[PDB]
Design a protein around this ligand. Structure first.
Ligand SMILES: [Cl-]
Ligand code: NA
Ligand code: NA
Ligand code: NA
Ligand code: NA
Length: 528
């Protein structure tokens, strides 16, 4: 069949390329033929395209498991049957332990293999379902988007909309999280994102004024669904913006299909979706891991018997078609600190795209101004308009200054009659003003002919017109080279006629003494 895309809401279901998967609660997921998958699953994702053996090279591929009892030809025929029904069949790239480690330059070959598989099997697009190390391994974050743009354009040439979807685990969707390059590079190229709102335990989000809402909290499931989706569709609460017309809510089919995240009470989903629609932002659908689990059995060998599609199929299909959020994006805007008197260019590193991913960087405008000749905060606002929408974002620019530093202002002792240069070994520096040694003055003098302590005060003048300054002090002590009688010590024993130095004087012992301090023994005591 032909490349078949979905114009309206989706119920996405993954399809296992394996048999008898073991459940989180001891159930079993049989392999199933594509032709048995409920019609209401209008997007079916073949799981998974991956590296099977490092020995085959770095480019991942898809190898049907023959034990599903479909030949290559029958598999192709079943996909053609789904397409004849207006249903889409994607290839899901990634999954657990996918072992994808692409290197820069691999994008041509990955694009070529995506095309080969798409043309052979009749796939309608590709789901990015990178997990764990694969999300960030080697150059995957560059290679995968680069390849997918090429694919998309290859099929656009023939009037075909090759679908691109992604299935990020939700915690990675924070504004500077690991999925950022995929979401940003492919803005305009992707049809929808179906994050996984499951298998993340106690992860969740903080709602100011309300509290913490966790993905595993079954008492607050309506709130979880509402708030995480509200945050995504508006780019609030530290999440990257995914437009509501492109947000599909990914869920476990049942308690065997995932560790956590199953919706106990479907009413929580209906009401959360209803609230989103009530604020003018209906979502695009739901997604499940998986059709095999929906058709599986529990530990007691009782059949799940399609409960997930029973609960959600009609709810999601019985909705109006999506209304495109055409707001544009700005990228690269980050608060920035700049050194006093450095050059600042408000446009560098900043870009913009329309809702279709076209570059509209030239249409960016900036209000506000930075004066790098004056420390302080400067607030800029960037704006861009396209498609009768406008996006605005602030940027704070802080101009700062670092203090210069002295070196060599160290207290020192020099010998009588030595030559002393107060500037020897003294310098100053500043990161931008450079060598400031010539801007140091010295207050005070040292007289090395005279024993004593000499204070020097160093001042540095700097900046524009040398109107800033800083100061430091140094003590230079001049000591004689004359030999003196030895210093008195409290525990020493001295003999009549022994001489010692103490408190600036020379004293001679008049008789035997230990522990008597010279100068303290009066007019007629032992030291004179
Ligand atoms: Cl499984
Ligand atoms: Na097709
Ligand atoms: Na509840
Ligand atoms: Na999954
Ligand atoms: Na000092």
């Amino acid at each position: 069949g032909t490349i078949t895309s979905q114009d309206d809401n989706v119920v996405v279901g993954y399809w296992h390329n394996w048999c008898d998967g073991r459940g989180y609660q001891g159930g079993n997921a049989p392999c199933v033929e594509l032709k048995t998958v409920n019609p209401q699953y209008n997007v079916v994702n073949i799981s998974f395209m991956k590296v099977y053996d490092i020995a085959e090279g770095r480019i991942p591929t898809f190898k049907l498991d023959p034990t599903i009892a479909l030949s290559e030809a029958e598999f192709i025929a079943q996909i053609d049957t789904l397409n004849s029904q207006g249903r889409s069949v994607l290839i899901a790239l990634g999954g657990a332990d996918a072992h994808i480690e692409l290197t820069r330059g691999d994008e041509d070959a990955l694009a070529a293999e995506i095309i080969r598989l798409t043309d052979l099997y009749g796939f309608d697009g590709l789901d990015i379902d990178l997990q764990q190390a694969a999300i960030t391994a080697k150059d995957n974050q560059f290679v995968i988007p680069a390849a997918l743009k090429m694919v998309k354009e290859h099929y656009r040439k023939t009037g075909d909309n090759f679908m691109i979807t992604m299935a990020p685990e939700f915690p990675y969707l924070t504004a500077n999280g690991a999925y950022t390059p995929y979401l940003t590079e492919l803005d305009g190229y992707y049809d929808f994102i179906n994050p996984q709102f499951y298998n993340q335990g106690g992860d969740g989000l903080w709602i100011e004024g309300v509290g913490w809402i966790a993905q595993n909290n079954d008492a607050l499931k309506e709130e979880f669904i509402y708030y995480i989706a509200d945050s995504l569709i508006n780019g609030t609460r530290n999440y990257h913006k995914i437009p509501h017309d492109k947000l599909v809510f990914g869920l476990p089919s049942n308690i065997d299909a995932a560790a956590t995240g199953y919706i106990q009470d479907p009413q929580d989903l209906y009401k959360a979706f209803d609230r989103l629609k009530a604020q003018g932002q209906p979502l695009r659908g739901v997604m499940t891991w998986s059709v095999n689990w929906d058709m599986g059995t529990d530990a007691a060998n009782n059949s799940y018997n399609q409960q997930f599609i029973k609960d959600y199929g009609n709810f999601i299909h019985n909705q109006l078609p999506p209304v495109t959020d055409m707001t544009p994006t700005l990228s690269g805007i980050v608060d920035t600190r700049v050194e006093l008197d450095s050059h600042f260019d408000p446009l560098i590193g900043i870009t913009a795209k329309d809702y279709q991913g076209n570059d509209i960087t030239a249409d960016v405008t900036v209000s506000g101004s930075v004066n790098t000749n004056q420390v302080g905060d400067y607030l800029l606002t960037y704006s861009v308009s396209s498609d009768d929408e406008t996006t605005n974002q602030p940027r704070k620019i802080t101009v700062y200054e670092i203090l210069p530093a002295f070196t060599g202002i160290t207290d020192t002792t020099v010998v009588i009659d030595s030559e002393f240069d107060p500037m020897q070994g003294v310098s100053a520096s500043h990161p931008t003003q450079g060598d400031l040694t010539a801007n140091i003055t010295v207050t005070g003098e040292v007289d090395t002919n005279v024993v004593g302590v000499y204070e020097l005060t160093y001042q540095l003048f700097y900046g524009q017109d040398n109107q800033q300054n800083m100061t430091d002090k140094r003590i230079v002590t001049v000591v004689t080279d004359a030999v003196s009688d030895d210093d008195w010590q409290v525990g020493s024993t001295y003999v009549k006629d022994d001489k010692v130095t103490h408190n600036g004087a020379t004293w001679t012992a008049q008789w035997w003494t230990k522990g008597e301090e010279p100068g303290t023994t009066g007019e007629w005591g032992v030291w004179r």
